[PDB]
Amino acid sequence: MNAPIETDVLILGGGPVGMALALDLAHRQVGHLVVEQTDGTITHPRVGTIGPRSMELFRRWGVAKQIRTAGWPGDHPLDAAWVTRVGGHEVYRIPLGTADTRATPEHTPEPDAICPQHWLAPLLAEAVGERLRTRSRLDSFEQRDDHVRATITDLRTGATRAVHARYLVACDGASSPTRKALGIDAPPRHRTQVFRNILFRAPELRSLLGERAALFFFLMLLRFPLRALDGRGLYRLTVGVDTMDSFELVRRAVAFDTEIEVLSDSEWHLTHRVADSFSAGRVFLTGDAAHTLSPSGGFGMNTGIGSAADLGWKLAATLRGWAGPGLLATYEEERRPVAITSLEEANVNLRRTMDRELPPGLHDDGPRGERIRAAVAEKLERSGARREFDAPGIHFGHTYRSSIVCGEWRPSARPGARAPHAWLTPTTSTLDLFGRGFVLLSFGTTDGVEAVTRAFADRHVPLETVTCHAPEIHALYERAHVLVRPDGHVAWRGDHLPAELGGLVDKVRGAA
Numbered sequence: 001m002n003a004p005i006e007t008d009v010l011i012l013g014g015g016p017v018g019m020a021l022a023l024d025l026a027h028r029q030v031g032h033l034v035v036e037q038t039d040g041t042i043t044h045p046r047v048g049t050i051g052p053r054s055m056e057l058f059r060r061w062g063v064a065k066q067i068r069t070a071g072w073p074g075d076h077p078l079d080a081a082w083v084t085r086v087g088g089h090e091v092y093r094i095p096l097g098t099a100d101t102r103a104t105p106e107h108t109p110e111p112d113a114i115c116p117q118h119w120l121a122p123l124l125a126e127a128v129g130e131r132l133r134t135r136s137r138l139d140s141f142e143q144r145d146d147h148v149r150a151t152i153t154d155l156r157t158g159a160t161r162a163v164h165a166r167y168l169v170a171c172d173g174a175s176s177p178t179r180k181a182l183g184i185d186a187p188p189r190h191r192t193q194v195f196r197n198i199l200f201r202a203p204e205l206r207s208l209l210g211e212r213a214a215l216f217f218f219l220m221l222l223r224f225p226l227r228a229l230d231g232r233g234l235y236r237l238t239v240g241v242d243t244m245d246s247f248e249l250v251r252r253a254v255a256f257d258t259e260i261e262v263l264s265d266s267e268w269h270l271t272h273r274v275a276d277s278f279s280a281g282r283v284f285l286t287g288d289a290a291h292t293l294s295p296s297g298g299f300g301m302n303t304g305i306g307s308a309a310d311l312g313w314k315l316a317a318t319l320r321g322w323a324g325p326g327l328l329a330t331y332e333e334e335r336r337p338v339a340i341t342s343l344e345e346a347n348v349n350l351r352r353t354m355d356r357e358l359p360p361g362l363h364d365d366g367p368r369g370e371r372i373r374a375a376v377a378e379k380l381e382r383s384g385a386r387r388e389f390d391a392p393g394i395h396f397g398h399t400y401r402s403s404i405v406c407g408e409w410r411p412s413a414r415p416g417a418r419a420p421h422a423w424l425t426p427t428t429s430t431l432d433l434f435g436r437g438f439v440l441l442s443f444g445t446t447d448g449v450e451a452v453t454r455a456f457a458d459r460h461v462p463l464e465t466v467t468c469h470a471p472e473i474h475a476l477y478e479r480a481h482v483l484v485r486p487d488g489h490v491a492w493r494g495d496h497l498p499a500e501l502g503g504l505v506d507k508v509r510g511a512a
C-alpha cells in the first residue's frame with residue numbers, strides 16, 4: 001500500500017522540452033519528477049538540429065559536450081543544397097563547412113549542433129537520472145489550493161500511483177491533452193500541412209556523394225527536403241501531401257543505384273498553434289503544448305527549450321519564496337509574444353519553399369539546362385533562401401519588453417535582450433556567469449554596489465556581483481552597470497544605479 005508521492009514540480013512528458021525543463025530544475029536544485037508514457041526509446045527521429053541558443057542552455061545544464069560528441073561526424077558537410085536529384089544535377093548550394101573546420105562563431109561560445117533524437121534522448125535521459133519515470137502515463141489531475149494531484153499509471157506493471165506536486169508543467173506535446181482539459185484553446189494560425197516522413201538507411205550513399213554530400217538536400221523534381229540524419233547512413237525524406245511507394249519515392253530522389261532500406265514511413269500533421277493562455281492556476285504549459293511552430297530553422301524545438309528555461313527560474317524563485325506573486329504570470333507575458341511573432345518567421349521559410357516553382361529543362365544535360373539551373377540559382381539567392389540557414393538574430397535577438405524589465409543584428413545588452421557573449425578566459429564566457437540568481441556586472445566603478453547587494457538581501461533575492469576590468473567587454477555592454485536575470489537576459493543597465501533600489505528589486509522579481 002503505497003502513499004502519495006511528493007515533489008515540487010511534476011513534469012508531464014519526457015520529450016526534448018520536458019527533459020530541458022528537468023535539466024534546468026536540477027541545475028537550480030528544485031525537486032521534480034518527469035513522467036513519460038513511452039519506454040523512452042526512439043524509433044523514428046523527429047528532431048536533430050539544435051540551435052546555438054539551445055546549445056548555450058545545454059552548456060549551462062552541463063550536457064553540451066556529450067551532445068556534440070554524440071556521433072555526428074566532425075568532417076561531414078553541413079551545407080544546404082538544392083538539387084534536381086541527390087547525385088543528380090545541383091542547382092544551388094550554401095557552403096557551411098564541417099563541425100571540425102567552421103570558424104568559431106564570434107557572437108556565441110556554442111555554435112549549432114546536430115544530434116538526432118535517437119542519440120539526444122538517451123543522453124538527456126542519462127543526465128536526468130532516476131527522476132525520469134518512463135512507461136508512466138498521467139491519467140488525470142485535480143488542482144487543490146497549494147498543490148496539484150495527479151494519477152499516474154505504471155504502463156510496465158499496471159499499478160496506479162498518485163503524485164502530489166506544487167506545480168504540474170505539461171510538456172505533453174502539440175495535441176496537449178492537458179491544454180484541452182484546462183479548457184484553453186490554441187486556434188490554428190495557418191492551414192495544417194500534412195507531411196510524409198520516410199526514414200531510410202543507405203550505407204554507401206555518403207561514399208558516393210563525398211564532398212558533394214550535404215546536411216540538407218532540397219529536392220526539385222515534386223519538391224521537398226531530404227536530410228542526413230546521423231551523417232552515417234541514416235537519412236530522412238520529407239514529402240508534402242496535398243501516392244507512390246515509400247521505396248519508390250526514395251529511389252526517385254536518389255540518382256544512385258545503392259542499398260536503400262526504408263525503416264519507417266509515418267505521417268506528420270503540422271498545425272501552427274499557440275495557446276491562448278500558458279497556464280491555469282498551478283498547471284503550466286510548455287513546449288509544443290503551449291506553442292507549435294514550423295520546424296524551419298529548427299525554430300520549433302529551440303523555442304520550447306527557451307520557454308522551458310524561462311519557466312524553470314520563475315518556478316524556482318517562487319518555490320524558494322523570493323519571487324513576487326506575479327512572477328509566474330510573466331512566463332506567458334514574455335514567452336507568448338515570442339511565439340505569437342516568431343511562429344511567423346518559420347512560416348515565412350516554409351512559404352518560400354512552398355511557393356517556389358520549377359521551370360522546363362532543369363534536368364537537361366546540355367549547356368542549356370546548366371544555364372537554366374544557374375537561373376534558378378540566382379532567383380534562389382535573391383529570394384533570400386540562405387536566410388533559413390543563417391539568421392543569428394532569430395536565435396539570439398528576442399528582446400523582452402515586460403513588466404519585470406526596465407526598458408530604456410548585433411549583440412546588445414539592452415534591457416530584455418540576451419546578455420552578450422565575450423570570453424573571460426579561453427574556456428569561460430560571460431554566459432558562464434549567468435544561470436543561477438541575478439548577476440550585477442560592474443565595469444570600473446564599484447561605487448554603489450554595496451547598496452544593491454543589501455537591497456537584494458533585504459528581499460532574499462539571490463545576487464552575485466562581478467567587477468570586470470576589460471574595456472572590450474565594457475564597450476560591448478555599453479554601460480557601467482548591467483543587471484542580468486537568472487535566465488541570462490538583461491533586466492536593467494546604466495552608468496548610475498537607480499535611487500530607489502527597493503523599487504528595482506521588487507520590479508525585476510515580479511513584485512511591483
Ligand SMILES: Cc1cc2nc3c(=O)[nH]c(=O)nc-3n(C[C@H](O)[C@H](O)[C@H](O)COP(=O)(O)OP(=O)(O)OC[C@H]3O[C@@H](n4cnc5c(N)ncnc54)[C@H](O)[C@@H]3O)c2cc1C
Pocket residue numbers: 012013014015016017018035036037038046047136137138139171172173174197266267268269286287288289294295298300301304
Ligand atoms: C509524427 C511526428 C513527426 C514529427 N516530425 C518533425 C520534424 O520532422 N521536424 C521538427 O522540427 N519537428 C517534428 N515534430 C515535432 C517535434 O517532435 C516537437 O516539436 C518537439 O520534440 C517538441 O517537443 P515537446 O517536448 O514540446 O513535445 P513532444 O516531443 O511532442 O513530446 C511530448 C511527450 O509527452 C508524452 N506524453 C503525452 N501524454 C502523456 C501522458 N498522458 N503521460 C505521460 N507522458 C505523456 C509523450 O509520450 C511524449 O514523449 C514531429 C512530431 C510528430 C508527432
Ligand SMILES: O=C1NCc2c1c1c3ccccc3[nH]c1c1[nH]c3ccccc3c21
Pocket residue numbers: 049224225238295296297298299349350353354388
Ligand atoms: O526538421 C525539419 N523537418 C521538416 C523541415 C525541417 C527543417 C529544418 C531543421 C533545422 C534547420 C532548418 C530546417 N529547415 C527545415 C525545413 N524546410 C522545409 C520546407 C518545406 C517542407 C519542410 C521543411 C523543413
Ligand SMILES: [Cl-]
Pocket residue numbers: 166318319
Ligand atoms: Cl508555491
